[PDB]
């Protein structure tokens, strides 16, 4: 059986700027157990039918996990753009797999704000599919060299989220797991 418990019931999730990737292999995968689970608010599949997942079998399966705002959930899809889609986590336009997300306000939000989750605001260019840029260098936005502490046309490219229990839904944290399927290593029952 595949270690889905270690992905969906994980103690902690990574920031979207530095999303975790776990490669799943040599196991039996139960998909309908998730599809029909009341624990999820969003379950959207691309290239595959969610009702046939138990019969389908694949090669490598990658589970990419991270935390974003509810309002940013719409960006986790092929053909979409935005700060997350372009500078944090880019999906290929021919992406094959399913995007699963749920409200984690009662799990991650803290009084005063949980600032352990970051995303990029700035980068020299847009990300390639599944590119994970975790550098901490200062971004320069002009002809002026930085050579030190951020300031004019020099920025620390990351920003934290003020995730709080008093936030509106769009500003509440959501746990997102993207299941990317290549196409016999991972196979359903």
């Amino acid at each position, epitope marked *: 059986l595949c270690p889905f418990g270690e992905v969906f019931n994980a103690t902690r999730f990574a920031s979207v700027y530095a999303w975790n990737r776990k490669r799943i292999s040599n196991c039996v995968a139960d998909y309908s157990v998730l599809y029909n689970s009341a624990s999820f608010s969003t379950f959207k599949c691309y290239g595959v039918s969610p009702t046939k997942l138990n019969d389908l079998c694949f090669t490598n399966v990658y589970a990419d996990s991270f935390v974003i705002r509810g309002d940013e959930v719409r960006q986790i899809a092929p053909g979409q753009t935005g700060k997350i889609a372009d500078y944090n986590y880019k999906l290929p336009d021919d992406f094959t797999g399913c995007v699963i997300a749920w409200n984690s306000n009662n799990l991650d939000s803290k009084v005063g*704000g949980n600032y352990n989750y970051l995303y990029r605001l700035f980068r020299k260019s847009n990300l390639k599919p599944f590119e994970r840029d975790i550098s*901490t260098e200062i971004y320069q936005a002009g002809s002026t060299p930085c050579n030190g*502490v951020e*300031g*004019f046309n020099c920025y620390f490219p990351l920003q934290s989220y003020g995730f709080q229990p008093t936030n509106g839904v769009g500003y509440q944290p959501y746990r997102v797991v993207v299941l990317s399927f290549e196409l016999a290593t991972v196979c359903g029952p």
Partner: antibody
């Protein structure tokens, strides 16, 4: 979001609430009768401190605490403050940086 | 980039001039005796939440002004435009 500094005499600054590794923590010196001087600061996520153009500036995310080590003159007698580097930022172009919180201050003689 | 502010001692206004253009990267602080400084104005003219409407300011490039419509403390201007970061001399109300 408060900053707590060590008492009068290493000089520590513990963060309680708010962001830590995502925001540079700087040290500012204020000798009696004088103005403010920025001496440097560090982003815990980077691990590298930058210095004003003698003093060791470091931080450790695991305890949400910043440190400054002073060693070997009488002319350096001053109150030392820690402060967090915050910014008001808009889309496209980010145009400001300032020091928002600020600890009680450490008296070093 | 050094800052020069005046008058050194004092509705009142305090001005701070940059030796070089610094866009809108200056700020203003209020420091009471024996206490840490607090933020008044950032990004040249934007008020910090909690700051009374009695406080305002504006300017661009080199010439900036802090205005108090009606708090006896020392006020400072700050330069975060470029390294090294610096501060003004301080004006006493």
């Amino acid at each position: 979001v408060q900053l707590v500094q060590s008492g009068a005499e290493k000089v520590s600054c513990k963060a309680s609430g708010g962001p830590f590794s995502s925001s540079a923590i700087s040290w500012v010196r204020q000798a009696p009768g004088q103005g403010l001087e920025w001496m440097g600061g560090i982003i815990p996520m980077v691990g590298t401190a930058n210095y004003a153009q003698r003093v060791t500036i470091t931080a450790d995310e695991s305890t949400s605490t910043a440190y400054m080590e002073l060693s070997s003159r009488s002319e350096d007698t001053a109150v030392y403050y820690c402060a967090r580097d915050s910014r008001y930022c808009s889309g496209g172009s980010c145009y400001s940086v300032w020091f928002d919180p600020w600890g009680q201050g450490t008296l070093v003689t | 980039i050094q800052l020069t502010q005046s008058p050194s001692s004092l509705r009142v206004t305090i001005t701070c001039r940059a030796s070089q253009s610094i866009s809108s990267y200056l700020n203003w602080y209020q420091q009471k005796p024996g206490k840490a400084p607090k933020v008044l104005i950032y990004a040249a003219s934007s008020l910090q939440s909690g700051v009374p409407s009695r406080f305002s300011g504006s300017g661009s490039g080199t010439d900036f002004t802090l205005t108090i419509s009606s708090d006896f403390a020392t006020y400072y201007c700050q330069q975060s435009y470029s390294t090294p970061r610096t501060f003004g001399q301080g004006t006493k109300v």
